[PDB]
Design a binder for this molecule. Sequence first.
Ligand SMILES: O=c1ccn([C@@H]2O[C@H](COP(=O)(O)OP(=O)(O)OP(=O)(O)O)[C@@H](O)[C@H]2O)c(=O)[nH]1
Ligand SMILES: [Mn+2]
Ligand SMILES: [Mn+2]
Ligand SMILES: [Mn+2]
Length: 321
Amino acid sequence: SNADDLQMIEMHELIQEFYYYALTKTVEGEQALTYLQERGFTDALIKERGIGFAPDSSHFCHDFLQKKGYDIELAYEAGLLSRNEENFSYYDRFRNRIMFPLKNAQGRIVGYSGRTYTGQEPKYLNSPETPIFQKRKLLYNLDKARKSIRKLDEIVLLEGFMDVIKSDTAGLKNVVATMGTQLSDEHITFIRKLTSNITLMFDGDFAGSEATLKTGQHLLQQGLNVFVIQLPSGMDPDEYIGKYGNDAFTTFVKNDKKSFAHYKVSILKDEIAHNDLSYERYLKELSHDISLMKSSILQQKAINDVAPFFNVSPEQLANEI
Ligand SMILES: O=c1ccn([C@@H]2O[C@H](COP(=O)(O)OP(=O)(O)OP(=O)(O)O)[C@@H](O)[C@H]2O)c(=O)[nH]1
Ligand SMILES: [Mn+2]
Ligand SMILES: [Mn+2]
Ligand SMILES: [Mn+2]
């Protein structure tokens, strides 16, 4: 029910204050605080994002919510507590982790991502699916980024919320990220209400490239204008910012922004040039991709940009389309 949903949100927003205190003030949170500071987190940024620390006692959140008069089973359903199936006892889901609040589209805290700082697995532990937290719907930073997304008529999608935090601080405000999942149909429905222009800047690795191709292809099919920013090999936005700085990052992002079709063929360049079977198949694919582009202007430029990769004229490529 809506009443129960509000209770769950309250739990999250109240424990946030305790997590924040634990991180910034307490002895147990000292190492976690140092970790964040070494990753460039100022006191102001930590406070702004409401970042905290979950102690390792396994009953920190439990006792707090119990003291505040919340139903323990509801706290379990809210994904803040886990349940020992043997004795039906409850304990903290998040233990010895740095706690990043996950806010919904209305800016209410509906879940957490807890990062290890001692090299434990998994690196990030998220809230489970709950009535208020759904990974297929939530886009990190969306409530904060909405204004700039509308103003700039563009949304930029990153892989990690950490990248979003750093990108925002660097000056790139129209950024969001899924919680480690493939962009859903629901996400795309939400996004297209804000803008038709979506730029993908995933990590500069094989998985990032594969995700870019897959996500970009689906966005293109849905009638969105897709662009790609390709980071240097082995880097994500956070790593690029840490190595080159904020100004270099915002310049880089503004520099090479390619339409999806151009990025795609550039990735397939070597295979096309050596494999005649792949040549034919990718010429057909790229022809189909370009045909899907709603922008007549960018459709024409894509034709001019893609044609050289197949050693054909723009007129020849246009004919195939
Ligand atoms: O164990 C994991 C790892 C990743 N993820 C989800 O996948 C996204 C991309 O995972 P990454 O591992 O690329 O995140 P990152 O590099 O920004 O993390 P740091 O090492 O810099 O701290 C993350 O933002 C997270 O949402 C998890 O949920 N659990
Ligand atoms: Mn990756
Ligand atoms: Mn990354
Ligand atoms: Mn990273």
